[PDB]
Amino acid sequence: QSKLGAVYTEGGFVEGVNKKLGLLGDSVDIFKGIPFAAPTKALENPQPHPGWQGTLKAKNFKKRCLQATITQDSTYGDEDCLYLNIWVPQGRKQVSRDLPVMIWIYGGAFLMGSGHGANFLNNYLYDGEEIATRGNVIVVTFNYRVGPLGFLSTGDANLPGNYGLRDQHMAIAWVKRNIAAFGGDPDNITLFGESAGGASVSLQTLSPYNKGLIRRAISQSGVALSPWVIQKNPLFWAKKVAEKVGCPVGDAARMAQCLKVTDPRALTLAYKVPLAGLEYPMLHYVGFVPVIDGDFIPDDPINLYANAADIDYIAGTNNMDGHIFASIDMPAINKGNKKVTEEDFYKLVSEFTITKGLRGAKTTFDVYTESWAQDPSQENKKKTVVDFETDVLFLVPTEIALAQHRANAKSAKTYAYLFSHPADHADDIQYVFGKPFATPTGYRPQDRTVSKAMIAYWTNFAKTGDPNMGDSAVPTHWEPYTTENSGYLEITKKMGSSSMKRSLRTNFLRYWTLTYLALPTVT
Ligand code: NA
Ligand SMILES: [Zn+2]
Ligand SMILES: [Zn+2]
Ligand SMILES: [Zn+2]
Ligand SMILES: [Zn+2]
Ligand SMILES: [Zn+2]
Ligand SMILES: [Zn+2]
Ligand SMILES: [Zn+2]
Ligand SMILES: [Zn+2]
Ligand SMILES: [Zn+2]
Ligand SMILES: [Zn+2]
């Protein structure tokens, strides 16, 4: 009476696990490995999964979709990978009903990842138990196709691309049809995701495929407008893979058919992204990502925001989201005894600004190095490189998306955040998922303070669209974003009234959105 038992879904009965929590009757029902789509076929759209007889034991995580290992010398996963997982919190009196539902989309540059995430201190990163039980929401995680198998495209009808985005959509659609049986409110689905998953969340809100499916969304460190999201020249990347696996490149239709019948592991390992000794910035080697296909993504994402007019929206970034990419593009910021120079930074800036030529490289270099005269230290110079990467890859796109969402809003509310701390300890996913509570030996009291606050805001927002209103108290009133106030919440280990701030790096935003765009394009 106080737990689910066998659950009736469209595909048949599903049985998970009940885990007692605390001493007084609370618990959580855990389902792992529920199929939401058929075994995949290489470079084909996802299809319904056939029903089953009897009761499916949803007891263990299922295989991720085929992807390269981090060494890039081998693969793991499987073509049969479109599975999802569900945590349902339970009180001590009766079974939960009408709960908000949060669907997580993982990141990993569209190239890697799974619904459970990295395992550390005997705990998977995306284990939904802490969010579910602390915020009284249902949490869903799931796998989607990544790499060439997720995103290879010719930019035309021969190989339209976006397979991995369709997989995400199929999991959302399944949740809408089925989650009420688990005690969820299907009218109240919130998507949330980080990095590539934040851009995915964004793209899902913009696609007409999701009309009437999504109530709210949270983009963490990535939006559809980030420069690494849309591949402008997919046929170049598809030809590269075709040459490497022995397919002819002259006819796009014959090339597409040959790629579809190539060993999926050879497609996956065809291109290795190099991380050392690179001619262009790390961005340039981001290949197998979403495309504008005229279908799932009907137009450039910037023109699609009418589709999210009634989707409440949080978007924010991490203080040093650009750090990883800065480290690759300028290794000197790692070694304490190696100098970043004006010449190194000019070069990096010029690569990012080539469509605006010499004039665009200089205006950008000059604005970012203005502070170097009075503060020429390496601490300031290296922080400038990180800020530059954070700005162009994450912060500026996120601010443009916030503005477009606010400008197209009907009933939708808009919220902005900046996360600042002190995987790296600086990353916000582990606090969103409550790892400082799930594995407390790895974390300090301040970490559990940060995590407690983020879960309160995230799950209040899921319940009501208002991060200040719900089952949890919050430390700072989070003011909805408008163009007038341009307010963002600064999330740190000590929050109070002054944590609600405004005009985040506004001179740099204005530089990129007005000054830099007002420059002539060069060829
Ligand atoms: Na757990
Ligand atoms: Zn199956
Ligand atoms: Zn696994
Ligand atoms: Zn297989
Ligand atoms: Zn009801
Ligand atoms: Zn659909
Ligand atoms: Zn490039
Ligand atoms: Zn160049
Ligand atoms: Zn992150
Ligand atoms: Zn900490
Ligand atoms: Zn207010």
Curated annotation (Swiss-Prot):
Keywords: Diabetes mellitus, Disulfide bond, Glycoprotein, Hydrolase, Lipid degradation, Lipid metabolism, Repeat, Secreted, Serine esterase, Signal. Mammary gland and pancreas. Detected in pancreatic and duodenal juice (at protein level). Expressed by eosinophils. Glycans are attached at residue 188. GO terms for cellular component: cytoplasm; extracellular exosome; extracellular region; extracellular space; membrane. Residues 3-102 are annotated as: Heparin-binding. Activated by bile salts such as sodium taurocholate. Disulfide bonds join 65-81, 247-258. It is an enzyme of class 3 (hydrolase). It is found in: Secreted. It comes from the Eukaryota. Its main location: secreted. One of its GO terms (biological process) is pancreatic juice secretion. N- and O-glycosylated. GO terms for molecular function: acetylesterase activity; catalytic activity; heparin binding; hydrolase activity; retinyl-palmitate esterase activity; sterol ester esterase activity; triacylglycerol lipase activity. The keyword 4Fe-4S does not apply. Belongs to the type-B carboxylesterase/lipase family. It is linked to Maturity-onset diabetes of the young 8 with exocrine dysfunction: An autosomal dominant form of diabetes characterized by a primary defect in insulin secretion, exocrine pancreatic dysfunction, altered pancreatic morphology, recurrent abdominal pain, and fecal elastase deficiency. Disease onset is at less than 25 years of age. Interacts with CLC. Catalyzes the hydrolysis of a wide range of substrates including cholesteryl esters, phospholipids, lysophospholipids, di- and tri-acylglycerols, and fatty acid esters of hydroxy fatty acids (FAHFAs). Preferentially hydrolyzes FAHFAs with the ester bond further away from the carboxylate. Unsaturated FAHFAs are hydrolyzed more quickly than saturated FAHFAs. Has an essential role in the complete digestion of dietary lipids and their intestinal absorption, along with the absorption of fat-soluble vitamins. This is Bile salt-activated lipase. The gene is CEL. The chain holds residues 22 to 553 of 753 of the full protein.
